[PDB]
Symmetry: C3
Subunit: 196 residues, 3 copies
Amino acid sequence: SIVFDIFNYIGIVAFAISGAIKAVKKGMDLLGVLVLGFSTALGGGIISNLLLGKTPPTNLIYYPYPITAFLASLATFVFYRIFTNVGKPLLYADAIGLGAFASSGASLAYSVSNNVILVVIVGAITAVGGGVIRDILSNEVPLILTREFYATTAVIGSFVYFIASDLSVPEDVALIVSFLITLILRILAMELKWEL
Amino acid sequence: SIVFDIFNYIGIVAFAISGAIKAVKKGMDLLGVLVLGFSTALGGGIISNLLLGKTPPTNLIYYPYPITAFLASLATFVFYRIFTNVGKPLLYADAIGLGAFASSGASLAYSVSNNVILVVIVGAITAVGGGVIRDILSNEVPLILTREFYATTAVIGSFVYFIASDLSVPEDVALIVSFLITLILRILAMELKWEL
Amino acid sequence: SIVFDIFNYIGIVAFAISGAIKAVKKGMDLLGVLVLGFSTALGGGIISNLLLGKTPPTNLIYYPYPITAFLASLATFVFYRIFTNVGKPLLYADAIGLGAFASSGASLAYSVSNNVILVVIVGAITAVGGGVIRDILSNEVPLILTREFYATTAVIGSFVYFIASDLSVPEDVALIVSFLITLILRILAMELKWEL
Ligand SMILES: [Mg+2]
């Protein structure tokens, strides 16, 4: 479906931006920024692929995905190399990626089996997995532990995808509703200071 | 066998307690405590499943296992939310899990192949793997490095399972002897201050 | 081919030395030193095997590989237990391993598929993966982030293996040229202070 394909690109771009921003804040230079953005963008899909027995992983064979990760990370580096003082919305980029991958990752797991536990947990791991790798490599406690509603919101997003698909909702709509609920939940938590 | 099934539940409960305790000590709140307990309880089995080519992992498809991880972590949070000053035996919970999973993890590897190296190493990775993930997420040097006899004791436990099975020992007995040797070795190291 | 087999042993020895050195510097004792050397030596091959769908991993079934990792780590511990003040060339050992595994890891991926992205990225992950695990376990930002030209040099080494193989270069020669370019690139970066 077109929405599934689009969400893959949105998630790759968003997580690449979040990883490249993290590296910029850490003081890394161009190539180190590319490494962290590339890893954050593709890590969730790779981990998800391994859990589902899909080898080699799509992110390592389908050329547009790693090319998109590379270009997004490079664009982020160049942007903040010029505009050093403008805001760096790491959590906003991460949140958009969380919604794109909780939905598309739940979709991939649901195609493997109708098991609600597999769909909800693999979907959530797809969503958070790139940011977990980013935080581990950065040598800091990850968001899934420091942000009280973060991992659960990914779980909720993959669960609403499962429920929608279970009710025969068309795949394009089930993905959009899952993405929107995940993103909205994150915006409320961030804007209403639920995690403080 | 009944002992294999029982050891799976014992290991899941024990490692969930150890992960939830770690999160409580870190100052996390309810949902963060659940995340760390869930991850510690199921991580070793997932890693073991991937190494042996078993996908999707049993911990993500067999409902009682993640349900047990969730309930054990929730019980731990509620207990220490009320009884804030009572002792938190993280290492004791981890040690019981180490014995339950070194034995059952060696059993799973032995069913795949009679290779002593595969059985001993995959068994040890099953045993320590959940606590390694816990310590990495907590952003601290893991027990497998800070505790001089920890990883080796898991190796010894999986090796005694291999030897017992190689001698035709019934599976229920081979699991019990492996579990007991692992746990006893850990109790001696902790009580006799071997790791100081 | 003979060069592929030799490079496996060179990489295992080199990364075992680098991991055992890291543990010695961290103040670990004998068994902890063995754990970190063993993990660094075998982690890249295990990760590479999982990405390519090769289970159980060769490093866990082919006896000479983990035996070599163990003996190399033990030799490193004994050496620095006696000669406490002599230099500890962690980065030099890591660099030799990087060249041995970028080449041999690219070779393994190329046997699975002619996809330049798969060959270059899996090759680079094979090369850096053991040192990434070492640095994560040591609880420090890994070399792939702190050393500006490190990860890219592994990528270049696996890419020159791909180009050589694509041009019909004999496998023994393609491995040697890949190894030499990776190692030389690392020597220049270290000696010419490119990463400062
Ligand atoms: Mg860390």
